[PDB]
Amino acid sequence: TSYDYCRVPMEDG
Amino acid sequence: SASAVYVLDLKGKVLICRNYRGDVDMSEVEHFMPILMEKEEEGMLSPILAHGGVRFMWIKHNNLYLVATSKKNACVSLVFSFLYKVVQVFSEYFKELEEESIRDNFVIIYELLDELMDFGYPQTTDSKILQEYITQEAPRPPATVTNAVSWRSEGIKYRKNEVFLDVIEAVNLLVSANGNVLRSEIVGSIKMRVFLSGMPELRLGLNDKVLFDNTGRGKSKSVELEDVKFHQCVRLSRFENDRTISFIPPDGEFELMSYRLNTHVKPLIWIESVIEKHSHSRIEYMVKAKSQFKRRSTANNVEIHIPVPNDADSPKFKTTVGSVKWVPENSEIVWSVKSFPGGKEYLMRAHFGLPSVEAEDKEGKPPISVKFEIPYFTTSGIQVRYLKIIEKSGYQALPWVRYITQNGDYQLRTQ
Amino acid sequence: EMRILMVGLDAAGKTTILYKLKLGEIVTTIPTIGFNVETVEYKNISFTVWDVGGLDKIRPLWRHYFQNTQGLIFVVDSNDRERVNEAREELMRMLAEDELRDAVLLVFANKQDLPNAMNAAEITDKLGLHSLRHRNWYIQATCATSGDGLYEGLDWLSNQLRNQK
Amino acid sequence: EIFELKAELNSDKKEKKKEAVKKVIASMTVGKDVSALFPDVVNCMQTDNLELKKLVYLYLMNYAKSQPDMAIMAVNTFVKDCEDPNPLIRALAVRTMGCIRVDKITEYLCEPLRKCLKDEDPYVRKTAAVCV
Ligand SMILES: Nc1nc2c(ncn2[C@@H]2O[C@H](COP(=O)(O)OP(=O)(O)OP(=O)(O)O)[C@@H](O)[C@H]2O)c(=O)[nH]1
Ligand SMILES: [Mg+2]
């Protein structure tokens, strides 16, 4: 997979 | 309720056969291929053939006809889902599925058809767990094959803790030749690649419309998931109560949810094609491709397949941007554009000859069908919001996501 | 590296002494409808033992081992006089063959805990072991619940397998 | 040919009878009447291997309608392998017991099936339930 990711948050309660 | 899972090939010889009940004779498979050739040479083809009182459910893979006979009032949805799960189990052991894998792995394929199905009732088909007591390289079967969490062997340990998502869209489209849009639906598929340590309990949270309406936020950007089909791993009762997606993930690649929503907004790539087909002389294609989507995102490698006549010859291609190859194996001009920015409009003009003596049979009119792929760009507007890692051990995992739009069957009917 | 059988009429305690030689216990065993095969490593010659039961539907199924067959043990049932006659007829059916020719005979006097049991001489005179040409036979008194006399019969058997020091 | 196959199948070393039974169920794969070699592969059944018992059980599963009177030389081995502490070999024995459609055999096989329907490890119970 040539593309790149983006971090998503963990808690968001 | 299958009776005898076969594996045929493209001639009618049995690569491997394995009967489960003995309620269908083993020499009934020799009656398959003449019945399929008879039913196909009169256009009455169906997946359910009939040799007297024995029904031939079958799917057709690359070289393989995975025929599975039955005799009673067989549960056909069960049989066909089992056949595609046999295809998926074989393709997760043997990275392609051809005749060159069935005649080499009879050590393990008879063990697999021994394991997957008993008496016609499929019972253990998750391949990542099935790789732990049926190997091509035996211990006790795992407690995963017993317990309710039947897709995740306990005690998996990684040094890092990464959760890779893929919210892959797939725009469908079917534009009729008058110029209006008939069926413009979007089939997303959040396809994870999990690497975690232990028995976690994720809680994926989308921007689902029913969740934003039960919360009270029904005026912001919310995707309207018309139907959502989850994996097994998602507990569906908790999803049905208050739209919470909680699941214990497998280890490896799988398809978490497969949503499907309609869209009454414009198509992404629009193909205004004309045809100057003079009879017996020539044909011309003043096809233009206007990119309706946003100015920021770049449609990587679009391939606007455009159906030429079957017997055209000696072409000419005046484009603006992007190469044209004429592919005569398929009778289409695969107009490739590598970087296709949103808002532009690239024009192409093919030009063929045509044979002066006319054809013998009519040909039909296949659709223009593009192959676009727009990364970092979700058409429906789904936004993953969080992914709560919950583990008794307790650690900080690293979730990730990326966004892709592709084609589904992005067809456009022609003149 | 020599193989050996255990045939005869059923309820003779033959799988009893089989797992006595194999493990060393008095095993609880159903009447052996099929067969049994394990091996015994003792005196550096592997005693691979092939029990076949004695039910009437499996009496004709003894010939299917008699290809590449090197030994023989007949296990008597001396506590049934009304069945030792048909056991003798079964034995004379089995020793009327041209395919079992190198296999020596080895009679085991089995279930030696009842006072009605005979010695190692009356059973021989009743079964007619002296009238067996080209047969190297030897009777042996073996008690199943104790396990005595088993390895001495196996020692005679190992004297029959190899003919060296 | 098949006689030398039987000669390898009446050996004392495991790595010739193992290739023998793999060659037998490769001959069964390509569509050969190897039905005449039935009571000689069943001597090579009671093995310490488990990757080999699956193949012999498979051969028993295909060739018991055609050798029905011969098939009574596996019942003691089924009730012998339905005591083993490994649950996989018990469930393999149980799903082999039902597939043999011989009317001289299923009368004998209700006792270990009765033993296994109440057995502990729930892999063999979920096999024995369908074996009923
Ligand atoms: N009292 C007493 N009974 C014995 C002795 N040895 C064997 N038996 C009896 O002999 C019977 C036969 O036991 P098995 O060995 O399991 O049966 P088998 O002799 O192999 O006969 P089949 O297996 O049916 O062909 C058992 O039920 C025992 O009760 C013994 O030393 N003393
Ligand atoms: Mg016995």
**Which residues is B305 bridged to in the sheet?**
B334, B369
Q: Which tokens is B112 given?
A: 């697999």
- Give the CA distances from residue B62 to residues B7, B10, B39, B331, in Å, rounded to whole numbers and listed in that order: 12, 9, 20, 22
B53: number of Cβ within 10 Å: 8
- Partners of residue D80 in chain C, C-beta under 8 Å: 36
d(CA B307, CA B317): 14
What DSSP string runs through B267-323?
Answer: PSEEEE-----BTTTEEEEEEEEEE-S-SS-EEEEEEEEEEPPTT-EEEEEE-SSS-
Q: Is residue B129 part of a domain?
A: no
Q: Is the CB of residue B306 less than 8 Å from the CB of residue B335?
A: yes
Cβ of C113 less than 6 Å from ligand 1: yes
**How would you classify the pairing of strands B386-387 and B227-230?**
unpaired
Residues B172, B411: Cα–Cα separation, whole Å:
8
CA distance B96 to B63: 11
β partners of residue B56: B49, B69
Question: Token pair of D60, please?
Answer: 């028993």
Could you tell me the sign of the dihedral formed by the alpha carbons of B342, B347, B352, B354, in that order?
positive
Last residue of a domain, one of B121, B139, B162: B121
How many CB atoms neighbour CB C16 within 10 A?
20
Question: Going by DSSP bridges, is the β-strand pair B403-405/B167-168 parallel, antiparallel, or unpaired?
Answer: parallel
Query: Does residue B324 sit within a domain?
Result: yes
Give nearest CA residue, ligand 1 atom 30.
C111
What token pair was written down for C137? 């036979």
Amino acid identity, position B216: G
Q: Residues B285, B316: contact at Cβ < 8 Å?
A: no
B177 and B250 share a domain?
yes
Q: Given the CA of residue C55, which atom of ligand 1 is nearest to it?
A: 25
Q: Where are the beta strands (DSSP E) in B2-102?
A: 4-7, 16-19, 48-51, 54-57, 68-70
CB contact under 8 A, B387 and A8: yes
Beta bridge partners of B5: B18, B68
CA angle C107, C43, C32 (to 5 degrees): 45
Instruction: Report the first-to-last Cα separation within chain D, whole angstroms.
Output: 40
Burial state string for D2-32 with b = 16 or more CB within 10 A and e = fewer than 16: eeebbebbbeeeeeebbebbeebbbebbeee
A-contacting chains (≥3 CB pairs under 8 Å): B
The CATH number of the domain holding residue B61 is: 3.30.450.60
Domain of residue B180 covers 149-415
Are B81 and B230 members of one domain? no
Tokens of B12: 């009618």
Please check whether residue B309 is in contact with residue B354, taking contact to mean a CB–CB distance below 8 angstroms.
yes
Cα of D80 from ligand 1 centre, angstroms: 17
CA distance B300 to B58: 37
Tell me: do B159 and B229 sit in the same domain.
Answer: yes
User: Counting Cβ atoms within 10 Å, is residue B386 exposed (0-12), middle (13-18) or buried (19+)?
Assistant: middle
Q: Can you tell me the distance from the alpha carbon of B273 to that of B268, in angstroms, rounded to the nearest whole number?
A: 16
In which element (H, E) is residue B113 found?
A: helix B106-116
Which atom number of ligand 1 is nearest to the Cα of residue C16? Answer: 15
Same domain, B156 and B91: no
Method: cryo-EM
What angle in degrees, to the nearest 10, is found between the helix axes of D87-97 and D53-62? 10
In the block, which residue shows the tokens 């051990």? B393
In 3D, which of B148, B158, B165 has the Cα closest to residue B393?
Answer: B158
For tokens 């008794």, the residue is B392
Which residue in the block uniquely carries the two structure tokens 């025929």?
A: B67
How far apart CA B19 and CA B2 sit, in angstroms, is: 9
The answer to whether residues B116 and B172 belong to one domain is no
Token output for C44: 């550096």
Strand partners, B211: none
Residue in the block written with tokens 């599975």: B68
B143 is a domain residue: no
Q: Are residues B237 and B353 in the same domain?
A: yes
Q: Is residue B141 part of a domain?
A: no
Which among B121, B141, B157 is the end of a domain? B121
Structural domain includes residue B32: yes
> Which of B205, B387, B402 comes nearest A6 by C-beta?
B402
Residue C37, both tokens: 């095969």
**To which residue do tokens 């969740």 refer?**
B211
For residues B179 and B267, what is the distance between their CA atoms, to the nearest angstrom? 12
Residues B100 and B233 placed together within one structural domain of the fold: no
Q: Which of B103, B121, B139 is the last residue of a domain?
A: B121
Could C35 and D73 be called an inter-chain contact, meaning their C-beta atoms sit closer than 8 Å?
A: yes
d(CA B364, CA B310) in angstroms, rounded, equals 10
Sheet of strand B282-291: strand arrangement: B269-272, B282-291, B345-353, B313-318
b/e burial code for range B82-116 (CB count within 10 A of at least 16 → b): bbebbbebbeebbeebebebbeebbebbbbbbbbb
Partner-chain residue, chosen from C32, C46, C65, that has the shortest CB–CB distance to D43: C65
Residue-range domains of chain C with CATH: 1-165 (3.40.50.300)
Does residue C13 have its Cβ closer than 6 Å to ligand 1? Answer: yes
- Token couple for D23: 């060659």
Residue B126: inside a domain: no
Per DSSP, the three-state class of B332 is strand
Q: Which residues line ion ligand 2, judged by CB < 5 Å?
A: C 15, 32
- Residue B210 neighbours by CB under 8 Å, 6+ apart: B225, B243
Give the largest CA-CA distance in chain C: 44
Give CA separation, B287 vs B273, B354, D105, D128, in Å. Answer: 4, 19, 74, 65
The three-class DSSP label of residue B29 is helix
With beta carbons less than 8 A apart as the criterion, state whether B112 and B133 touch.
no
SS (H, E, C) chain D: CHHHHHHHCCCCCHHHHHHHHHHHHHHCCCCCCCHHHHHHHCCCCCCCCCCCHHHHHHHHHHCCCCCCCHHHCCHHHHHHHCCCCCHHHHHHHHHHHCCCCCCCCCCCCHHHHHHHHCCCCHHHHHHHHHHC
Q: Which residues contact D40 (CB under 8 A, 6 or more apart)?
A: C64, C67, D6, D9, D10
Give the count of beta carbons closer than 10 Å to the beta carbon of residue B211: 18
d(CA B7, CA C12): 49
Q: Which of D36, D81, D73, D27 is nearest to D54 (CA)?
A: D81
Q: Please check whether residue B282 is in contact with residue B351, taking contact to mean a CB–CB distance below 8 angstroms.
A: yes
**Residues B231 and B108 sit within 8 Å (Cβ to Cβ):** no
Helix C14-22, helix C150-161: angle, nearest 10 = 80
C76 within ligand 1 shell (Cβ under 6 A): no
Within a domain: residue B131? no
Residue C20 CB less than 6 A away from ligand 1? no
Which residues pair with residue B412 across a beta bridge? Answer: B175, B368
Question: How is residue C110 annotated by DSSP?
Answer: -
C32 lines ligand 1 (CB under 6 A): yes
| Residue D9 identity | L
Q: State both tokens at B275.
A: 């045809």
Q: Which residues contact B10 (CB under 8 A, 6 or more apart)?
A: B63, B65
C-alpha torsion sign, points B139, B143, B146, B151: negative
Whole-angstrom distance, CA of residue D124 vs CA of residue B231: 27
Give the integer Cα–Cα distance in Å for D45 and B313: 67
Closest CA to B168 of B301, B259, B304, B267: B259
Q: Kindly state whether residues B99 and B197 are assigned to the same domain.
A: no
Yes or no: say if B351 and B315 are a contact pair by the CB < 8 Å rule. Answer: yes
Cβ of residue D16 closer than 8 Å to a chain C Cβ: no
B275 shares its domain with B169: yes
| Structure tokens that stand for B390 in this block | 């919950």
Helix (H, G, I), strand (E, B) or coil at B110: helix
Same domain, B17 and B158: no
Could you give the 3-state DSSP secondary structure of residue B333? strand
If asked whether residues B262 and B367 sit together in one domain, one would say: yes
* Residue B226 CB-half CA count within 13 A: 9
Breaks (C-N over 2.5 A) in chain B follow: 137
Same-domain pairing of B175 and B45? no
- Amino acid at the residue B141: P
Dmax (CA) for chain A in angstroms is: 33
Domain-embedded: residue B132? no
Total number of domains in chain B: 2
